[PDB]
Symmetry: D3
Subunit: 264 residues, 6 copies
């Protein structure tokens, strides 16, 4: 079909309750039952010769829709561009400054907190967002207090990193060992291959890959990691492994969301 030609993506994403496919009256009705909302947050950045530039957004989005569906949580629109400053020496990377992302998060949370949302669960696909997100939460809490927003004291934000789930790390170790690496990992590439089997990329991977975890300026990054991979053999990925990572991430983060939303 002309409009809808990513069928695996559509099966995974168009489940549960998306904010974008709801009316304001439906959101008002939802808010009688729950004050929780899930934001998928990723990145638009290089993922080596074979990785999708959207990998982090693709992963977060797909898992978030799954968690929404499993928990009854409303799922907001995906934050597609985050803090990816160190990947800007590769073309197609888009990044905000940390200071810009903090203001974006502040704006999102303030609008929704005024409506009565108080449990904000960010399902994150990009390690580089973690620090800025946590900073943004702190900035946001102080802003809500300064505004004397009615529910300010109740408003809570948490980031859940799908790639830090214990079930996910344990499977990646079992399948890929010390070739999982830190960026353009076979686990995340596996997941993208499951969501978008039509976009599986064929490209050579140099047989030696730069290792280590050191990340400074964009210019330094590309010198250290010339093809953009850190330590990783994404050629071990399969869409079958991808489904496994999807199912583990959704199960573990459904429990995590429910523990969050049900906590005081």
């Amino acid at each position: 079909d002309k409009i809808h030609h990513h069928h695996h993506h559509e099966n995974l994403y168009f489940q549960g309750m998306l904010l974008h496919l709801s009316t304001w009256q439906e959101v008002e009705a939802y808010l009688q039952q729950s004050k929780g909302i899930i934001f998928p947050i990723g990145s638009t950045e290089q993922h080596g010769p074979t990785g999708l530039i959207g990998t982090d957004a693709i992963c977060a989005e797909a898992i978030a829709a799954g968690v929404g569906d499993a928990t009854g949580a409303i799922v907001g629109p995906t934050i597609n561009v985050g803090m990816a400053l160190h990947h800007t020496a590769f073309p197609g990377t888009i990044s905000l400054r940390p200071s810009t992302l903090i203001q974006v998060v502040r704006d999102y949370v303030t609008c929704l907190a005024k409506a009565g949302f108080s449990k904000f669960y960010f399902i994150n696909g990009h390690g580089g967002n973690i620090a800025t997100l946590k900073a943004a939460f702190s900035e946001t809490y102080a802003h809500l207090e300064d505004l004397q927003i009615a529910n300010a004291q109740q408003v809570q934000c948490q980031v859940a990193n799908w790639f830090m789930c214990g079930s996910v790390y344990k499977l990646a170790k079992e399948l890929y060992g010390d070739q999982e690496g830190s960026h353009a990992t076979p686990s995340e590439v596996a997941l993208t291959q499951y969501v978008y089997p039509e976009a599986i990329k064929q490209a050579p991977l140099s047989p030696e890959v730069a290792s280590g975890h050191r990340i400074y300026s964009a210019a330094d990054f590309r010198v250290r990691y010339p093809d953009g991979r850190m330590g990783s053999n994404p050629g071990l990925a399969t869409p079958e492994h991808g489904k496994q990572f999807y199912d583990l991430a959704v199960k573990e983060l459904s429990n995590g969301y429910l523990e969050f939303v049900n906590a005081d």
Copy 2:
């Protein structure tokens, strides 16, 4: 029978090496930009992002453009008294646009075509374009003088305005319009909403604070009867918009 061949690509479904190859033949990129805001009793909160994203995909598919990820939240401050609206400040959106365009300009992109679904974004976007040009000059980005941004508003296309007037007349209105709701019904037939619509609807175009807005427009509609929308009409709006914006994109990217 027919085949389906897509000219362009989603940035998100491309590798850095595919982007590099692309920049050898073109310096253009399309961004769909919408909004997450109330659209009345029957309208999707995502309407403007859905319309932008679908049209932008169609234009990419007909022209060869790389299409970037959808900017899903925009300048919707006057809609914040209805739950589910998310808005950036204008000042925040200026810095987001500045950040997007600076990163891609450094890579050699120079023609940024924003396909917009929300009239509230227009002023802030144009302001962002001016701010960005001056920033690119300040940083002495190698291609700064060649970098061009344009906003194309699907709902201002002459063929769209004309078809809306034929189909809906004075019941098109200004917000939660049957033409935009019709497009969302075509795109997502299984998300078509049923709710009551009061027969009298507040008219006029005056928009100030969020709290004033909800008093003037109690259900969220401005002048509109989105109950007139059909997915069949939707397909006509899609086609008209994609044609016109495909020609617009190509006229822009090939201009000096």
Copy 3:
């Protein structure tokens, strides 16, 4: 009838606020207007029109915003511009101060097309800020921009007198108005026969490549001060009616 804020005492502004909540700001720009045009053109037009509207309506007229969003003209010497982000914070500051005192109808009489997008962005920023601050009248505060050069009567007279030679910048209509206001500062300079048509505006460096003498499509040699008085009187009449329709609306 009308008063310049600058020529009023605070006690007079207090007395004014018992009878009206409206204030007019002239907003222009400091930018090149071709070989014969004044760098202050947009400020001059806006200031003079706003004074006349004040006189006709009894409105209080604030001080002229002389520097606006003119970034695309900075490749010509004498241009002064704010960043859009700066002008947003300027407008937010102006309106917050005056909203706190009781003003709630802000009518910006604008002389520069480059300001419009940034002003509309500034309005939206300002409404959310007044709500954040819980300013007493926040919900009633309204801002409107009125562009003298988009008045129906002004556009019509421009089209009748100059046709396609009006163009988009350094226009004979605005130059005519400035000749009327400052007959001592009427400029004579060469005007190359060739002038770029089209409306494309990007970086400042690109703008001067496209529009080498600073004009966009215009023949400002057609301007006379007699035409200038007609534009003045027309803009004052139409924006006097616009101001009153605004301040009396709900």
Copy 4:
């Protein structure tokens, strides 16, 4: 001799820049000046003095910065103020635009004491910004603020005519100068015999508690326009000499 930037073409500014790198900005404020003082006082004084200095020196005079840092006066209706942070970004924008064109001696003729600290902060911010941007003339760019009310001759005449009744705000010297410039706008209003002495300025709410009619220590009833002309002529002479010593220094 001197030219208003607003009444010049870009070609005239280009010709000017072959002979001089200097520009004068009048900077004032929009704020209460007691029962008899004009809200535009500081702008009016600065604008008029700067015009006269331009005439005497051949300097180009930029458009008047009409709204400055007047936050402590916002409990009185009609005050307009920028935040210091906003005024910093305004000055940075002005000077960056003009430095790029070749201007390198920026002489700010100031009418409001409240601006001084923010202007000096703005200068320092601006120098670092021009260095960050590697603007061609960055190292040569200099800004100076000249406060007409701190001119030695002005202070002296004020002390001779008014003594201790000069005070610190809504002063007879500044009011005299405004009567001279706008004889049509001379105000009459009651002036309570009691007026607070002392110089303490904190929040806007505290300021109006301390200075209930807006005056600080002043008897502006002493002002005449004849005194106003003396202050005008003195400020023009001293700041004409100050401008020339500035533009000719290394």
Copy 5:
């Protein structure tokens, strides 16, 4: 003595080479030999009934001076106020916004990078600074690139958290067990008692202490942790334990600084 009445502090702090006790010519001479600089970073925040409001700054400062002395590193002036937004419901807490701290770090690093410093080792005493600091580094790298600062590509920042040293955690476990907690910990209080034996505080500690690690708004924080402690029995601290923590932290972070400054 009248001017100098904190003698243990002075013995620990006035060693090695402090930037503040150097001329510009001495700094120029230093830069021929090394491009590294240590910043102590702490916080000004409540530390329970018995903890010093300066604890995080006191700890970072004292350890940084020790590391400077052991390594030959120049030690910059202490960043006394950081990101402590969640402690503001207790009087005497001072905090920056994350966005403000990012600009502070950007300004410090830009000035020093222009002079030729390229290895910035932040010895941190406050967990709440970590996210904002990492964000600030990223913002700073992109700023240095935008400025085309001569050494931009070489400039590296790292944060080293004294309380996350493996030798420190291992001693705290051995001495305090599960009464170490997360805030106003006996380990950090022990360290302050060693640096400032004259400022040892006597105050009652409620025998039950709120546990858990959840931190949201300042208002929520004080409800959760009424005396300001998280999980901790700082009454187990002694100045003798303090010396041990000081010596372990200096040894481990001297190795960490040397590994950092000597790395490519």
Copy 6:
């Protein structure tokens, strides 16, 4: 023989419960604010922070004030062409001051006395005070109308200026002065520096860009012979400053 009794306390050496008790009797707090900047061939980079911090400690010790932690980096942009200078932008320092004062004002502090060692901080600090008052009003902080900030510059004390003129005459100068270097020698006798000082020193008070500053003042001095400094002179400056600022603090905190 003599005893030493200190009236006030360092905020850093106090508990939150001691601060609460203190706020029952006083709403005053002192901040030492200095700078990290070159001070010529013989001057400490920390001079302004050292002088502020020592004087502020002395004032606390004589008056009962709580003294906050030293603001060690200030507005020193014109000193950045000499290595070891650290400066905030004025705009950054405004937000730092705003953040400090907002947090402490919410706790009930209302008299903020800044003991300053660097003339370059004065303009930015005064600007910060105005910005902060407006911010406190915007936030409707309970004590906003009572919050007062003052800057006291030790080097502008009448008794300090007078003693400097007696001791050093026209060789005091404007930067890296013998009076400030003398105070640092008294405070830190073991950090006294020996380096050559050219007998001719550039005079005048003109300060613009950092690069201009180094051309005008090649060794960093403005008009000064800091070789005249002794720690004995230092003690006199310390004593004079602490007396005058102790009276200043008490006059401020007890004023309406």
